[PDB]
Chains A and B, each alone.
Chain A
């Protein structure tokens, strides 16, 4: 299939949330972006067959000047036989530059070098902007303060994600991302947060990295497997279960917005000796439509 790197440079502060409005996150999983893509394709009156049948995206990872970051793989690192706080430094570390990814998979990285890699990330700063609600003041009430957490990417930094699919799927992705540049991604995109510009191009470096074949597999997107594959993939695996929850965002779902069914997915960067392909899990209950949660798997091979 065709692989395209999409680089997102954000012109405005961005509100990515995990559980609350005040919480600000620097990245979004693949499920959030797939929800945005489905919403956009519905707005643009476009078919959902390509996205639901062949699109394979990853999460959004940091990038900066001359470095593209990948999730820290969940491998058994030997550390230093002297100190245990080296493992603390490794757990604090979260993202590895693409150049150092193979080295980290082969060890060869000290705890001090791990902290250096962690601090080498040049991805913006998060803040908490406090706003008010004045709608109660007209009918004999008080102003209600409330905080929104936002994230400001540094001028040459931003997010990126790889996308794999057919030529037609890649074209639909290009059109939908062009529309999404102005639709915005985030949690307050109707109040200014999340305006961005995307650039979609084929990357030789990342294509070569994906072409690399190793003994183990690494998840690049928040994914989960069905029972037939879950009985086999879990053997000798190091993963992390993320609790994907959220409210439904759509006018036609119900008279009032209600929560989705709680989902659990393998975080990006988990290590599996056996590879699995995810499914688009339906997380709606008794709804007018079916809410889609993305759990397909984008695999990066590695040597440990």
Chain B
């Protein structure tokens, strides 16, 4: 019947990750945090948007993109197959940062030298420290047992681009670089065999 490929992994920041929040205290360019534990998170919205954008650039809306990430157009109502949960600050990295007396986030100081007066304009952005690891949880809905292999090839392409690309923040300036580590890929619901399936 219906199948739900459950993928669990760790996202290791290679450089500082800055997923800002428009809305703890006064912080210059704060990052998004969990409301309760006040631990930085990666919203599933950011991961889904980046993966969809990279798949759009690679493939090119395209039928595969709408099949994977869902669409709501007239005559084009397709449920999203990729339900990407928030990436929570991992417990192991939490203990590793409790040791060494290392804060979970850092303040990066930047400038903007004007082309007109050559006056540096100071700025600050919060970034999750490069040693952090976020537990990520993705669900793939097997709506079509024939399209699932092509969908996972597209997912692998998206993850490859994203590893070579950045996550939320100013990535062209070095922030947000990550690396996925797929701890397991399991089919919690249904019977679709995903043992051969593998991202990366």
Interface positions of A (Cβ within 8 A of B): 11-13, 43-45, 124-131, 134, 145, 147-148, 150, 152, 154-155, 178-179, 182-184, 188-193, 195, 250-251, 255-257
Asked whether any CB of chain A lies closer than 8 Å to the CB of B127, the reply is no
A182 to B142, CA, bound (A): 13
B156 CB-CB contact with A under 8 Å:
no
By Cβ-Cβ distance, the 10 closest A-B pairs, closest first, are A192-B44, A130-B22, A190-B80, A127-B35, A192-B85, A152-B35, A251-B77, A152-B36, A192-B86, A256-B74
Complex-state Cα separation, A97 to B2, whole angstroms: 39
The total number of A-B Cβ pairs within 8 Å is: 90
Q: Decide: B75 and A191 in contact? CB cutoff 8 A.
A: no
The size bracket of the interface on B is 35 or more
0/1 per residue, B3-23, Cβ < 8 Å to A?
Answer: 010100000000000000111
Q: Give the CA-CA distance A32 to B183 in the complex, in Å.
A: 34
Residue pair A182, B35 in contact (C-beta under 8 Å): no
Residues from chain B with Cβ under 8 Å of A191 in the complex: 43-45, 48, 83-84
Inter-subunit contact A251/B78 (CB<8 Å): yes
Chain B residue nearest to A183 in the complex (CB):
B4
Tell me how far the C-beta of B72 lies from the nearest C-beta in chain A, rounded to whole angstroms: 7
Task: Find out whether the CB atom of B36 lies under 8 angstroms from the CB atom of A12.
Answer: no
Q: A11-B137, A45-B2, A191-B83 are in contact. List 8 more A-B contacts (CB 8 A).
A: A13-B35, A44-B1, A127-B35, A129-B21, A179-B2, A191-B84, A193-B86, A256-B74
Residues of B within 8 A of A195 (CB): 83, 85, 137
Point out the residues of chain B lying under 8 angstroms from A184, CB to CB: 83
Q: Is B92 an interface residue (CB 8 A)?
A: no
Write out the residue numbers on chain A whose beta carbons fall within 8 Å of the beta carbon of B48.
190-192
Question: Could you tell me if B43 and A192 are in contact, using CB atoms closer than 8 angstroms?
Answer: yes
The reply to whether B45 and A128 form a contact with Cβ atoms under 8 Å apart is: no
Which one of A12, A43, A131, A192 has the greatest number of beta carbons of chain B within 10 Å?
A192
Closest Cβ of chain A to B119, distance in Å, is 28
Say yes or no: is B70 at the interface (Cβ < 8 Å to chain A).
yes
B32 at the interface (CB under 8 A from A): yes
In Å, the complex CA distance between A131 and B92 comes to 28
Tell me whether A182 and B74 are in contact in the complex, defined as CB-CB below 8 angstroms, given that A12-B85, A192-B43 are known contacts. Answer: no
- Structural contact, A43 and B86, CB atoms closer than 8 A: no
In the bound complex, CA of A128 to CA of B36 (Å): 13
**Docked-complex contact A134 and B53, CB < 8 angstroms:** yes
B2 pairs with A129, CB closer than 8 A: no
Seen from chain B, the residues whose Cβ lies within 8 Å of a Cβ on chain A are 1-2, 4, 6, 21-23, 32, 34-36, 43-45, 48-49, 53, 70, 72, 74-75, 77-80, 82-86, 88, 137, 139, 188-189
- Expressed in whole angstroms, the Cα–Cα distance for A192 and B32 within the complex equals 14
Separation of A32 and B62 alpha carbons in the complex (Å): 32
Residue of B nearest to A127 (CB): B35
Chain B residues near A148 (CB-CB < 8 A): 45
Contacts of B70 in A (CB 8 A): 190
11 A-B Cβ contacts within 8 A? A12-B85, A44-B1, A125-B35, A147-B23, A152-B36, A182-B188, A192-B43, A192-B48, A195-B85, A195-B137, A251-B78
A130 to B168, CA, bound (A): 14
CB within 8 Å for A128 and B23 given contacts A134-B53, A192-B86: yes
Q: Most chain-B Cβ atoms within 10 A of its Cβ — which of A147, A179, A182, A251?
A: A182
Find chain A residues with CB under 8 A from B75 CB: 255
Q: A179 vs B77: C-alpha distance in the bound complex, in angstroms?
A: 22
* Complex contacts, A190 vs chain B, CB 8 Å: 48, 70, 79-80, 82-83
> Smallest CB–CB gap between A206 and chain B, Å?
27
The answer to whether A192 and B35 have CB atoms under 8 Å apart is no
Known: A13-B35, A129-B21, A152-B35. A257 touches B83 (CB 8 A): no
Interface residue from B23, B77, B80 paired with A130 (Cβ < 8 Å): B23
Question: Beyond A130-B21, A251-B77, is A182–B84 a contact (Cβ under 8 Å)?
Answer: no
CA distance A45 to B143 in the complex (A): 12
Contact check, A255 vs B36: say whether CB atoms are below 8 A apart.
no
Instruction: For the complex formed, measure the closest distance between the CB of A32 and the CB atoms of chain B, giving whole angstroms.
Output: 17
Report whether A131 and B45 are in contact in the complex, using a CB–CB cutoff of 8 Å: yes
In the bound complex, residues from chain A placing their C-beta under 8 Å from that of B78 are 251
Instruction: Tell me which residues across on chain B come within 8 A of A125, comparing CB atoms.
Output: 35-36
Are B22 and A145 within 8 A (Cβ)?
yes
Q: Are A134 and B21 in touch, CB under 8 angstroms?
A: no
A248 to chain B, nearest CB (A): 10
